[PDB]
């Protein structure tokens, strides 16, 4: 009976493959044969933030496009005013092994997590004027690799085992648990409407989950190696992933297949962070060879290179108004580019 | 700058000052990543102190030691092992009762071979190019009856000489020693220990002092 189920699953995979082949009448690279290229993008370092003293592993922008969180390999989660290079907060973490950051859309809460398997949510706006651990979310088995805020009540976390969770904050138990991956869920990204989200794991595949319904909608394959970063398109119908194959890949939700492969022969090392610019034209991807390339999301040619970091880039983010790009690297400085 | 902007700059400078003292306090503190082939001998290494990763903060001779155990992580370790790139040293726990007890499967993939594979994946890692290993052999009292009841035949099919403790333990130590490839940039110290010895912290302090003075000779540009 097990062999019959395996053969039926193989037939289903073949059916998915031929449906994707039938729906693929053309390519995006074929259509973008007469479109105007972006030219060369000259992004220079407007600000540098020289406060951390260890390797920065995460960074997240506030929705006001001004405040930054950044976590390093001390107990330090620093909140910066990026306009005036000013530290507005320095939250001391109980565990220095932090691999992720989150800034709430309201800006009240900041989440952290990492090798300590728990998600600490800090309330910034308290009557006592300090930062307090508003919540301590436990229940994940592996290391917490990514966390994103839906709103002030709910948070979606991705762990180092084959699960993702949607939690509640006033009651610290998980609202739902998404379990369809086979591998360590290394990245997680939310739609702008926050109704669906894509999680990318170590099985070289991304999955699109519905937050309210609680089950997988689509599974996207194509990557040779495990993927480390996913960002949605600003339209919300597409997303680009980056792996250790040195290839970004733009998948589309409604086509249920990949559209583009951003690759170059000069780059061979993996991709750590991927973020779209506003309107979804540029694609800033940070690599392991100390650089940060800018691709065009429509045609696979490369724009300028954000080469200013002395170590590898671990996180990169674009503001909600698209003003500037903050790249946090493995040296202690994170640089703001425009 | 306005009045509130000047006061915010003053607050940021005070944050810079306190953060610099916190970083200087954290700098004078050695980090030991404690790895092992499951629950074999790590319990005793925690036991002469005197969730996922667990951190112990013992001290010895006015030196603060932070020892991290990640045996409860139980995931694919290549994604998070770069967080321990800046540790002072890698303590490795290998049980000498690992052979002849397979403990995982029916007949294959015994404990000594997976301990070998974990050691080879750790000492030849791309991040641990220069960190040293303070590899332990945690079963001294149990090894003599293990080699008395059974020869070293179910692993290392080559001869171990005889069934006495000294040359067999030297064979285990030598076969763990030649496993690394970068013989120059890192060293394995290979202490032998039991569950009653209290000299583990002295050998750890000696290896830590060697790593510190080698890092200082790196820092002064003379190594």
């Amino acid at each position: 009976e097990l062999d019959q189920l395996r053969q039926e699953a193989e037939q289903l995979k073949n059916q998915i493959r031929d449906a994707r082949k039938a729906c693929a009448d053309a390519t995006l690279s074929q259509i973008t044969n007469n479109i105007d290229p972006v030219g060369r993008i000259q992004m220079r370092t407007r600000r540098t933030l020289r406060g951390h003293l260890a390797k920065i592993y995460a960074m997240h922008w506030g929705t006001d496009s001004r405040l930054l969180v950044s976590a390093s390999q001390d107990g330090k989660l620093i909140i910066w005013d990026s306009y005036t290079t000013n530290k507005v907060h320095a939250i001391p973490l109980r565990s220095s092994w932090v691999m992720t950051c989150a800034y709430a859309p309201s800006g009240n809460y900041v989440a952290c997590g990492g090798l300590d398997n728990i998600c600490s949510i800090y309330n910034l706006k308290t009557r006592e004027g300090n930062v307090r651990v508003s919540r301590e979310l436990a229940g994940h088995t592996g290391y917490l690799s990514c966390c994103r805020f839906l709103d002030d009540n709910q948070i979606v976390t991705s762990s180092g085992d084959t699960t993702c969770a949607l939690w509640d904050i006033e009651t610290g138990q998980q609202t739902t648990t998404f379990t369809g991956h086979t591998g360590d869920v290394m990245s997680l990204s939310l739609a702008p409407d926050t109704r669906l989200f894509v999680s990318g794991a170590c099985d070289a595949s991304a999955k699109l989950w519905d937050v309210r319904e609680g089950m997988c909608r689509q599974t996207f394959t194509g990557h040779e190696s495990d993927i480390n970063a996913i960002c949605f398109f600003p339209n919300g119908n597409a997303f680009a992933t980056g792996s250790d194959d040195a290839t970004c890949r733009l998948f589309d939700l409604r086509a249920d297949q990949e559209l583009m492969t951003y690759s170059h022969d000069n780059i061979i090392c993996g991709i750590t962070s991927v973020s779209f610019s506003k309107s979804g034209r540029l694609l800033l991807a940070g690599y392991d060879d100390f650089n940060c390339n800018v691709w065009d999301a429509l045609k696979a040619d490369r724009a300028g290179v954000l080469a200013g970091h002395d170590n590898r880039v671990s996180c990169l983010g674009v503001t909600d108004d698209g003003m500037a790009v903050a790249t946090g690297s493995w040296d202690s400085f994170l640089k703001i580019w425009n | 700058l306005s009045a509130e902007d000047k006061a915010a700059v003053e607050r940021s400078k005070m944050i810079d000052r306190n953060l610099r003292e916190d970083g200087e306090k954290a700098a004078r503190e050695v980090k030991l990543l404690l790895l092992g082939a499951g629950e074999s001998g790590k319990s005793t290494i925690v036991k002469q102190m005197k969730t996922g990763i667990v951190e112990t903060h013992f001290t010895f001779k006015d030196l603060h030691f932070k020892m991290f155990d990640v045996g409860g992580q139980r995931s694919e370790r290549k994604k998070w092992i770069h967080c321990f790139e800046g540790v002072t040293a890698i303590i490795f726990c290998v049980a000498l009762s690992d052979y002849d007890l397979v403990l995982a499967e029916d007949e294959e993939m015994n404990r000594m071979h997976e301990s070998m594979k974990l050691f080879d994946s750790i000492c030849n890692n791309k991040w641990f190019t220069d960190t040293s290993i303070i590899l332990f052999l945690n079963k001294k009292d149990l090894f003599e009856e293990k080699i008395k009841k059974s020869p070293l035949t179910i692993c290392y099919p080559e001869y171990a000489g005889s069934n006495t403790y000294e040359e067999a333990a030297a064979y285990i130590q030598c076969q763990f020693e030649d496993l690394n490839k970068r013989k120059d940039t890192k060293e394995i110290y290979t202490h032998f220990t039991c569950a009653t010895d209290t000299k583990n912290v002295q050998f750890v302090f000696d290896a830590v002092t060697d790593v510190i003075i080698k890092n200082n000779l790196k820092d002064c540009g003379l190594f």
Partner: single-chain antibody
Amino acid sequence: VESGGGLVQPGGSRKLSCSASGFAFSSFGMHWVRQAPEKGLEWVAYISSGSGTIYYADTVKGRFTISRDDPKNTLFLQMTSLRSEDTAMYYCVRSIYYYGSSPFDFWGQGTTLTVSSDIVMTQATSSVPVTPGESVSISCRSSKSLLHSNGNTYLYWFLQRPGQSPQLLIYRMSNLASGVPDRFSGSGSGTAFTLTISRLEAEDVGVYYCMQHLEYPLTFGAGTKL
């Protein structure tokens, strides 16, 4: 909370002492603004976070000395030379200064002791009808336009209910504080500022003060009692 201080003295020297209760006193700048029994509020002294920059008013520059002790969370104002001008309720104020902060948010209970250039804030209106449920508006004018280059006017509106300490209503132009209802708004730009009330209850009566925060010898607005 915070309270404590001194009492009546003829022409002597006194150390006012207030004790902070559980709001991380070391990270808060502290003001010592004072209020005469029939006049309005006026600013006296300021100690910053970690005893850094210290500011005084133009009349108490040498006579007064403000200090803090982060052990026991205590604040001192030592006055050596005492005149007949400074018989007042002395109203200790906390204020934290970061980007999204709301300074002057919490005020001490105030202790009364009897002895026996700058921006001039007018507030020409002083009395309005006390009827509830209406929409009363309170205007404010300054001498210099307190619009800074970063784009926010540093003008604050406080409510002093008759009987207790004044409470911050809005901490910029159109920046509602915490714990204040949504019936207030800033609606000011440049020099003219216009606080407005949607509906008046019995708890909205009191004296309304406007305070600039552009340059540090900061002046209040002499009150507009409803």
